[PDB]
Amino acid sequence: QLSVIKEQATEYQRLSSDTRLVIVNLNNNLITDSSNFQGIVVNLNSKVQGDNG
Amino acid sequence: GYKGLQVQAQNAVTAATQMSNAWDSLTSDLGSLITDLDKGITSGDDIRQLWL
Amino acid sequence: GYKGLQVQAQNAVTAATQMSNAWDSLTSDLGSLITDLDKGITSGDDIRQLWL
Amino acid sequence: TNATTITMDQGMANQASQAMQIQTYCNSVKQQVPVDFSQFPNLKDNQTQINQ
Amino acid sequence: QASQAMQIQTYCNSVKQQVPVDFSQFPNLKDNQTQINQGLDLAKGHADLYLNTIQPQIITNISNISNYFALQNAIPAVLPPGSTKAQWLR
Ligand SMILES: [Cl-]
Ligand SMILES: [Cl-]
Ligand SMILES: [Cl-]
Ligand SMILES: [Cl-]
Ligand SMILES: [Cl-]
Ligand code: NA
Ligand code: NA
Numbered sequence: 001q002l003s004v005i006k007e008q009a010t011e012y013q014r015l016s017s018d019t020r021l022v023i024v025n026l027n028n029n030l031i032t033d034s035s036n037f038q039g040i041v042v043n044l045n046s047k048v049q050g051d052n053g
Numbered sequence: 054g055y056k057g058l059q060v061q062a063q064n065a066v067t068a069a070t071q072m073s074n075a076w077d078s079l080t081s082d083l084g085s086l087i088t089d090l091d092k093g094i095t096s097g098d099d100i101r102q103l104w105l
Numbered sequence: 106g107y108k109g110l111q112v113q114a115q116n117a118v119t120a121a122t123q124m125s126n127a128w129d130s131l132t133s134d135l136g137s138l139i140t141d142l143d144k145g146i147t148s149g150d151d152i153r154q155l156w157l
Numbered sequence: 158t159n160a161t162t163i164t165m166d167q168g169m170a171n172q173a174s175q176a177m178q179i180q181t182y183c184n185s186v187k188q189q190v191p192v193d194f195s196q197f198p199n200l201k202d203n204q205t206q207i208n209q
Numbered sequence: 210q211a212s213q214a215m216q217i218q219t220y221c222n223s224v225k226q227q228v229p230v231d232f233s234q235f236p237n238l239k240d241n242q243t244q245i246n247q248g249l250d251l252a253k254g255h256a257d258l259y260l261n262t263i264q265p266q267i268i269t270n271i272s273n274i275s276n277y278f279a280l281q282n283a284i285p286a287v288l289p290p291g292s293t294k295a296q297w298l299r
Contacts, residue, residue: 002090002093002094002105003094005090006087006090006091006094009083009086009087009090010083010087012083013080013083013084013087016076016079016080016083017080019076020073020076020077020080023069023072023073023076024073026069026072027066027069027070027073027184028187030062030065030066030069031066031184031187031188033062034059034062034063034065034066034188035187035188035189035190037055037056037058037059037062038059038188038190039190040055041055041056041059042190044055063188066184066188067184070180070184074180106185106186106189108228109182109228110182110183110186112226112227112228113178113179113182113183113226114179116175116178116179116225116226117175117176117179119175119257120171120172120175120176121172123168123171123172123261124168124169124172126164126168127164127165127167127168127169128165128168130161130164130165131161131164131165134158134161155158159269159272159273159276160269163265163268163269163272164265166265166268167260167261167264167265167268168261171260171261174218174222175222178222178226
């Protein structure tokens with residue numbers, strides 16, 4: 001009964017660990033999007049700075 | 054528009070990072086449980102009780 | 106950004122070092138307790154009260 | 158003992174607050190934007206250096 | 210709303226995170242640089258001392274006091290049931 005719980009817990013630990021990798025991927029996707037957006041704003045700002053001169 | 058989206062995304066990063074940390078605690082805590090069980094299954098009469 | 110990250114890392118070293126030293130005190134202090142019990146300076150009756 | 162317990166406590170806390178700071182800085186660093194000097198042939202090398 | 214210790218803790222964490230400055234591109238600020246960086250370096254020293262030596266020390270000393278008087282939460286003013294006056298004085 002203890003060994004079956006230990007096996008079971010080990011299965012769940014692996015699932016937990018796997019979920020974490022999925023989340024890593026999510027974080028990188030979000031970080032990429034956030035970054036691309038910052039870039040857009042920066043490039044627009046520089047075009048407007050130019051047009052104002 | 055993009056400034057606003059940028060903020061939403063940045064907030065999303067924070068949220069995702071918090072999710073990571075939450076799952077890390079679960080994994081580590083399951084690890085502790087696995088250790089405690091394993092060391093209790095292969096131990097003396099009162100040492101067994103300690104680990105369990 | 107790099108300069109700042111460098112600082113964050115340096116701060117992290119300090120923090121990690123403090124954690125190691127905290128664990129070292131626990132280990133050393135448990136050692137003292139083992140010695141004190143073995144030498145008969147303390148007993149499991151009064152050590153029990155300490156922990157509770 | 159009492160003081161050792163507190164050292165463990167404080168050690169943990171200092172390490173976790175510190176961790177959030179570097180965590181944030183790392184998420185913040187990963188969000189940074191490359192440079193583009195493509196309109197300046199004389200800076201082509203500085204670009205590949207900076208972005209690497 | 211934050212405890213006294215939380216306020217000092219915040220200041221400490223905040224100061225430790227600063228980055229030293231480099232005004233080498235501004236000769237007019239050479240002195241401000243050495244002032245800022247010396248000031249900062251010292252402050253980080255103080256911060257570390259608080260975070261890993263003083264705050265714990267305070268929490269420790271108070272725990273010890275707190276426990277002892279938790280147990281001895283009162284003083285027997287009369288002679289407690291069944292004791293020599295000799296034992297009571299000890
Ligand atoms: Cl999955
Ligand atoms: Cl753009
Ligand atoms: Cl103590
Ligand atoms: Cl050029
Ligand atoms: Cl490039
Ligand atoms: Na040791
Ligand atoms: Na200072």
